[PDB]
Amino acid sequence: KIRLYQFLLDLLRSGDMKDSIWWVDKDKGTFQFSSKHKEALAHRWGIQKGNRKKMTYQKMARALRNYGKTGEVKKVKKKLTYQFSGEVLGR
DNA sequence: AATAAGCGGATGTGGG
DNA sequence: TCCCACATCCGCTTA
Ligand code: NA
């Protein structure tokens, strides 16, 4: 199954949910979720994974926090903003 | 208060 | 066995 950081990177490349997520500085890998439309994107993640329960932005962000150590995605000190690692962007 | 984002420990589930 | 890569639950903190 596709990994969460890859799901998000794929969405940013396709632009299929442009109203839910967007690049801030794509060269730096920084991206931001929509305050009002992030739940629709979270729902899509859960359906793609076939999880038992409805996915929520809160649970999706809890999963993102677990990348902080290994570095695939880091939280930026801006609202709803995150940053992919160079390695993630390179692949 | 109402609303929202942030934080993260503890535990449960998948598929190796 | 026991790690992977989250999912889920819960409560606290900050704005
Ligand atoms: Na929020």
Side-chain angles (χ1 to χ4, degrees), chain A residues 2-90:
Chain A
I2 183 168
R3 290 189 71 180
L4 173 57
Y5 70 82
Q6 190 68 48
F7 169 80
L8 297 171
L9 186 58
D10 290 349
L11 277 183
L12 282 158
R13 286 172 178 155
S14 76
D16 193 45
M17 298 195 83
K18 285 166 178 120
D19 300 334
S20 296
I21 191 178
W22 47 82
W23 290 117
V24 179
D25 183 335
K26 58 198 167 174
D27 283 39
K28 298 180 185 173
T30 56
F31 61 97
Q32 178 179 48
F33 295 98
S34 170
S35 180
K36 261 187 73 58
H37 303 294
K38 61 195 184 307
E39 294 299 343
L41 178 157
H43 295 160
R44 179 176 173 153
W45 169 234
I47 285 157
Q48 187 163 136
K49 285 287 299 291
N51 293 330
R52 178 180 42 246
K53 316 238 164 196
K54 180 183 77 181
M55 177 57 57
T56 64
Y57 181 79
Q58 176 168 353
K59 286 182 298 189
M60 189 185 73
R62 178 73 188 91
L64 288 178
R65 266 196 303 289
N66 295 141
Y67 292 135
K69 200 173 188 303
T70 51
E72 291 90 343
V73 181
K74 288 188 167 189
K75 186 70 182 63
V76 171
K77 302 268 194 198
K78 298 294 187 189
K79 175 175 166 142
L80 298 172
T81 304
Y82 292 83
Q83 182 172 23
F84 293 114
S85 68
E87 294 66 17
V88 164
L89 302 162

